[PDB]
Amino acid sequence: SKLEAILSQEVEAEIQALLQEAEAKAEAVKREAEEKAKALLQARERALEAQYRAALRRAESA
Amino acid sequence: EAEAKAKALEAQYRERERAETEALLARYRERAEAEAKAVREKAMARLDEAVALVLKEVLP
């Protein structure tokens, strides 16, 4: 039947829209997780090198 | 992987800190002993100019 095929089309269209929305969501999720992890790694070179340099400052002064 | 690279860079730069700190401080110790010995050994031959001066200026 026509509406046999049309309800099959509706199920396929809702599944395809569902998975496209899920693709956009998963891409934004891996984007935000990678941005947070790289903000971590960018902050850690500051948080470690500043400690190392201040240690050499006070060691040289001592 | 974030915790592993954090811990690895921590152990790496604390090894670096420890080794370069002790290598700096022992060298400053060596140069300090050398400077103290050098000023004492320069002053020893320089001495006996002083004792006559102070004993001349205290006494009338």
Total domains in the fold of chain A: 1
What token pair was written down for A14? Answer: 């809702």
Residue-range definition of the domain harbouring residue A5: 1-62
Which residues of B carry a binding-site annotation for Ca(2+)? 57
CATH number at residue A52: 1.20.5.620
Question: Do A55 and B17 make contact, defined as CB atoms within 8 angstroms?
Answer: yes
Resolution of the model in angstroms: 3.8
A52 to chain B, any CB pair closer than 8 A? The answer is yes
Please name the method used to determine this structure.
cryo-EM
**Distance (Å) from the alpha carbon of A39 to chain B's nearest alpha carbon:** 11
Task: State the sign of the Cα–Cα–Cα–Cα dihedral B30, B32, B38, B40.
Answer: negative
Q: Both tokens of residue A61?
A: 């002064």
Local structure of residue B48 (DSSP, 8 states): T
Token pair belonging to B35: 């400077």
Q: How far apart are CA B7 and CA A53, in angstroms?
A: 19
- Asked if residue A39 lies in contact with residue B1, where contact means CB atoms within 8 angstroms, the answer is no
| C-alpha dihedral sign at B19, B25, B28, B34 | negative
